[PDB]
Amino acid sequence: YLGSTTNQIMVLSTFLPLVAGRFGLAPTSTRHTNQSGIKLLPAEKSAGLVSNDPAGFNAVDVLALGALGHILGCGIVLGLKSTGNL
Amino acid sequence: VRELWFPGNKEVVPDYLDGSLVGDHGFDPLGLGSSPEQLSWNVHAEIFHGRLAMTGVAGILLTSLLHKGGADVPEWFEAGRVYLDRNPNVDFGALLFSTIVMSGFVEFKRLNDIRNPGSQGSGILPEDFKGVGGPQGRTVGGPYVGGRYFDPMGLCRGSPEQTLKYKWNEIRNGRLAMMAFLGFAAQYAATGKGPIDNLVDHVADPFHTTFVHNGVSVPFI
Amino acid sequence: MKDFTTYLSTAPVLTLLSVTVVAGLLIEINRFFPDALIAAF
Amino acid sequence: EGADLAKVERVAKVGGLYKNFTSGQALSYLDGTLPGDFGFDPLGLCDPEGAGGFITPEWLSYSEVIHCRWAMLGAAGFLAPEILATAGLIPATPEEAVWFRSGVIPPAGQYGKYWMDPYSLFWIEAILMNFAELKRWQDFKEPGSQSKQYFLGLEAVFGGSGNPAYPGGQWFNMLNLGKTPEEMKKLQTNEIRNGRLAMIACLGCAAQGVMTQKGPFANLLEHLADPVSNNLLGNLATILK
Amino acid sequence: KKVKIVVDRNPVATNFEKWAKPGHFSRTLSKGPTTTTWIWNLHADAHDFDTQTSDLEEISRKVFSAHFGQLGIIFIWLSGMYFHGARFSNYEAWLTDPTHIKPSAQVVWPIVGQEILNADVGGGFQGLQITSGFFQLWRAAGITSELQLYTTAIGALVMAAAMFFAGWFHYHKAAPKLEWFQNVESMLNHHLGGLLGLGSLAWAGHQIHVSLPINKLLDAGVDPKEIPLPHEFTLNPELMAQLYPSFSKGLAPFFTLDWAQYSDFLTFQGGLNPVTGGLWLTDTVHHHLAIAVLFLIAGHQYRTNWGIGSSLKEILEAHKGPFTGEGHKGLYEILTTSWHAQLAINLALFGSLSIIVAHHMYAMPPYPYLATDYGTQLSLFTHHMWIGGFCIVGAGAHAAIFMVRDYDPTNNYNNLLDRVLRHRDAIISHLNWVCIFLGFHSFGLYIHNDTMSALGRPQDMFSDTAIQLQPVFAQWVQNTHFLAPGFTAPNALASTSPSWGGDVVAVGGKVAMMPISLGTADFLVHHIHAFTIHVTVLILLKGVLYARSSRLIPDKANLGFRFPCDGPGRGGTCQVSAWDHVFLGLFWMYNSISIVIFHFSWKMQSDVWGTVSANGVSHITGGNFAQSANTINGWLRDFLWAQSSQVIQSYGSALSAYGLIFLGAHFVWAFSLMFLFSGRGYWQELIESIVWAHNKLKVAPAIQPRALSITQGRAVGVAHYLLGGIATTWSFFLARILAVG
Ligand code: CLA
């Protein structure tokens, strides 16, 4: 199973939002979106979370974005599986 | 102060159970004797229960020891029916009525002792049935009735220390006898033999003859 | 205790207790002496 | 919030993957006292404001120490029967000296050769542990008692100390180890680190027992045999077989 | 800031002193009962925690502990149910032959000839015939033993003790602070994820490991005493593998995302199991797994102690548009400070949920051998309908109470509540017009049918034989649902219910579910339902809106939520409060729900329930709903005179009790009229004469007999009316369905 296309796509769909969230491409625990939902606000430190990362990707950022990555990846893998692909 | 039913935990019931009563270790977790009048009633009840259970357990033990030497004595749990069979001319109702009438005379005597502590050592009775008092600071009446008739051999007249020691012996043996009779009833329900029978069954083989192996305690085994 | 017995003397509890006692008594009487239509003495 | 920097400087001084999991709320009340205080508290359970019931900084620390001691006992007792059977020193096949096949769970196995059946052993356990634990609890509530009432002369060693988790009287600290309060703190941190490791080990042993149906030492040996195939992922097909 | 646990230690001392003195909570109730009105107000204000304390902290703590007490009562009730199933029930006998043994779980004593009530249900047993659907529930769980019911009953008793201990502990030993209760985001996170989510997931686990192999073997047909016990199925995948082969691969497909391999027990089929007449337990397994995952996802929305998450306040404040001014500004503050607002919302949603449950359980029976149990069908539907109606009226009442007590105009300026309160006359005017129009075009249609039938002009009345009124939209929706599997539901093998259309699902010679046709009579009854619902919502809405003020009585909120009147001035102001609006809404809800259950009973006995005779379905009443329900005389004759034959002729049978209550309830209802047509003054002067009679013999009480207050007279009247009506309908339904069916 390791290295197969369902593994490539799962690891890709879990890893990509982790990159997106660090470099300000995705909303995390510091940088939220305004009421329009489309523009991202600057980082606030009101959450009270500290980390050893330079940017400040906290453990909760990792949990949230990896969880969403698994949701998206499960959806994508099962959608490709359930349409004759994969 | 004194020894408690629970070392530490001085949150023993408020000082209506101070170290004054005989047998007092602060055991009233459910507050059944908080008010003084109810506490006096409970002291009477405990002493009477201890004495009656001491009598009953001694009778049960001796009758179960005789029933092991083959003597024509039934076990304690079948003595009533055995006697009624072996004496067919007696009527259950008659025996039950007589027991309630003769017990009633003395129990009305004790009742009117509790109502008025000194009132029963006069009239037909002499004056020794007036009672020596005891708990709650009363100097007359009570569960402890001295005189030459309930204390004929004078084992609490003279030497207050000796009186206290014997009072403690009575109370502790009474509590033990009450627990023992509860054990008798429970063992008879769970096994169906006599008390001495159960004891010798256990000592003969200490294992495989516990409460687990009777099939009623641990219900599934 | 004194307050517990005072609670047991309240109308809501004592009434319910007395109704239960009288009901139980009538139920026992009808269980032992059933179907009694007249005062046959 | 932005931390306090000076407060979380001490957590960075303990080193390791700590600091990565500590928060500003935790450092408001975790200042270094209590051994094993590395600031890990993501949920603020030891917060002294609004404490009560069993959620208090004292009860929580006491329970952690009690658990670490029970878990060290349990981990040593999980490993010892199996390693002694595998070494052949004791007479039990290594698939019978496994910890969960000892009669604790009758459906999972039994060792019907005890000098009493398990239920009666549990009865005597209940009585004796009721004595021990009830005395421990009433010493926790009343921090000086249990040494006043008679107990066949045992009451001499039941005075305790300040911290209920460390009574260290005449018996609980027979060898009188750690005569320096600094050395006492160092040994306390030894005890707590070993105890937390043993908590993790005991949970792991239970999970492996469900997951592989073999002994913890047998699981370790079969993992060292072929690591790639004998692991958590490899065993995912055959789990209760 | 930062959600956390806060408690006060030992706020209250556990004594018995206050039980000795009734009325301790309320200052007005204190100082003795000078009159019997004290006795009544002692109970009327027992749980009104608002009037016992103004501190929201204390109110909240009392609510928390009262909830624990309610949970303890429910656990006592469940323990009783399971214990009666274990001891005084024919459950083990009913498992073997579920089609001919009548479920029972309550035996009576011999004491006064009441032994006759012990029905010859079956299984060599005698007892009352239960209709609570517990046997079907237990079989669906996968019990198949009377030891397991005993274990469950004892566990429920232990849990009841735990609930009562928890309530005592959290009121007297560690009581939460107010800022704990106001953490609505954390409570929502835990009730979406932890409660409903993990609960659904755990139930799916149980069904997969217990309810599915056991019920598979029972449905294959096996004496239950030979089936392996549930732990045997659970602990070795060998047995499950022989039953469900995908268990031979274990959890590897799950963590590899090859979930299709679980298709043998995670099915998407719909319809009913042909052997049991219930939904496929594989379908319900898949359902519970899916919604458990969905609720775990739902429970991560709101923000707590970490940056991620949304804020309820921020979400609410951001939904404002041109037509609403400030929109939801201030809704958050009036929801996390007033308990009655939450009570109104939760009661409304809970009653609607109960009604939805009733609907979805008659149409698509979820338990094995429950569709064929016609008594269980009818009883469960009617019970949940009545529970839903009561909860809805309670929602109206507590909306009124919040509008009277917990509403301040300072924070509700030009927001949604202010906008609604600022145009209530338009809402009420238009709703009253709708009620008029629906009442006319629903009841006048029935009266036109009656008049034309009595005149001998059936070609004029509205019926299938003449002027048709056909539910085109409902029929179109039925057809669309029928055509779904394979079209708009490609992976569904069959329709969700045999009521859309298709074939007749019959089990054991009895119909489980067959297509339901909608015609002119169905049109008429649906519009009757709309009319009654609209009048009820009009009454409750008008009460809520005019709770505070009215052009007639502007200072109404100064008189309180519950006051009788405001004198005979202004022409008479009887029943002007919000409480009296709830009082009338109770009557209208009774009328509504009663018509709903009559419609269900007649339609099911006339077009669904029956027996299959190898050539067609022979329904209980024979199909007379389609032609006779068009007229009022049809309901009085072909449903109410005709179907009452089983209740009035029940003397000397096991249903004789239903013959008594049917009569007895007729008493209570009529008795209620005493309280609803009379007024307090007559009774006060009558009691004055009675008290003179007592005085003449020195037996007057020192506590004054006082006639009931006006509010209490109305409350007693409505309570008796509802009790009598509901008991009559309950006994009639039960006797009818337990003598036929
Ligand atoms: C049902 C609602 C409910 C709610 C909302 C609360 C809420 C609270 N309780 Mg409480 N409690 C409840 C029920 C509830 N309790 C019941 C029914 C009991 C009787 C058993 C208790 C007995 C109790 C005590 C003795 C104490 C509290 C305390 C507290 C407070 C601390 C919260 C905490 O840290 O818990 C944390 C929970 C844990 C650390 C471990 C939870 C493990 C338990 C056994 C639950 C697991 C069972 C699970 C739900 C079912 C899974 C089955 C399993 C086999 C897989 C908190 C405000 C503490 C307090 O005083 O406040 C400061 C306190 O000491 N509660």
Ligand code: CLA
């Ligand atoms: C490696 C685990 C470990 C460690 C480092 C400690 C460390 C400590 N314990 Mg602790 N304890 C442990 C396990 C441990 N304990 C377990 C499992 C239990 C449950 C039985 C206890 C129960 C316990 C109590 C009740 C108390 C302590 C106390 C103490 C402190 C006293 C100093 C000391 O003697 O150190 C311990 C030195 C070592 C652990 C190194 C020795 C390692 C070997 C393997 C020990 C084997 C035991 C030995 C072979 C048995 C015979 C020896 C003896 C009878 C002659 C100290 C910080 C006392 C205290 O806090 O004083 C105030 C205190 O009251 N312990």
Ligand code: CLA
């Ligand atoms: C996983 C977390 C969790 C769970 C499972 C629950 C579950 C429940 N809560 Mg609770 N709550 C939680 C978190 C949780 N809550 C948190 C974090 C808060 C703080 C805001 C609250 C605050 C809160 C309030 C104010 C109230 C509840 C209430 C309830 C009960 C709802 C009534 C009912 O009949 O439902 C269904 C019934 C059941 C599912 C039966 C299950 C019963 C078990 C024993 C639940 C016990 C689990 C307990 C919550 C975990 C800790 C206990 C431990 C410390 C001993 C329900 C049992 C209401 C209540 O009934 O009061 C008691 C109520 O008033 N909760």
Ligand code: CLA
């Ligand atoms: C979760 C549900 C719920 C909760 C918690 C509450 C809570 C509350 N309600 Mg309420 N209510 C509800 C649902 C609820 N209600 C529903 C569904 C309705 C519609 C009927 C109402 C209608 C309502 C009104 C009209 C009023 C309240 C009032 C109150 C408050 C005082 C209640 C009280 O102590 O009266 C005392 C309790 C009693 C008098 C018990 C008797 C109740 C009836 C007569 C019992 C019926 C008999 C029973 C079914 C058994 C019959 C068999 C018989 C032969 C023995 C209180 C905070 C009062 C208030 O002022 O609010 C502040 C108020 O006047 N409620």
Ligand SMILES: CCCCCCCCCCCCCCCC(=O)OC[C@H](COP(=O)(O)OC[C@@H](O)CO)OC(=O)CCCCCCCCCCCCCCC
């Ligand atoms: C059950 C569901 C999940 C539970 C989650 C919640 C539990 C919270 C536990 C958090 C721990 C507390 C803080 C830890 C913080 C912490 O780690 O402390 C640091 C730890 C020990 O530190 P010390 O106490 O020795 O500190 C002194 C030194 O660190 C000085 O620098 O050092 C380590 O790095 C050991 C951990 C390595 C972990 C080895 C595990 C290897 C598994 C790898 C798996 C990856 C592949 C998987 C493929 C499937």
Ligand SMILES: CC1=C(/C=C/C(C)=C/C=C/C(C)=C/C=C/C=C(C)/C=C/C=C(C)/C=C/C2=C(C)C[C@H](O)CC2(C)C)C(C)(C)C[C@H](O)C1
């Ligand atoms: C309140 C209380 C108690 C009791 C107080 C009382 C109630 C005192 C007064 C008691 C009285 C007046 C008792 C009267 C008892 C009459 C009895 C027991 C009659 C018994 C006969 C029976 C049951 C039948 C015998 C047949 C037999 C078997 C043979 C046939 O031919 C038929 C038949 C006649 C039916 C006790 C327990 C004693 C102690 C005290 O601490 C608490």
Ligand SMILES: CC1=C[C@H](O)CC(C)(C)[C@H]1/C=C/C(C)=C/C=C/C(C)=C/C=C/C=C(C)/C=C/C=C(C)/C=C/C1=C(C)C[C@H](O)CC1(C)C
């Ligand atoms: C820190 C924190 C904080 C934050 O904030 C939050 C959170 C996250 C919650 C956290 C965390 C937590 C955790 C991790 C927990 C875990 C624990 C454990 C695991 C324990 C165990 C623990 C463990 C334990 C006790 C164990 C013990 C054991 C034992 C006794 C055993 C015994 C035995 C033996 C010897 C052998 C035999 O044959 C059997 C028996 C008899 C059986």
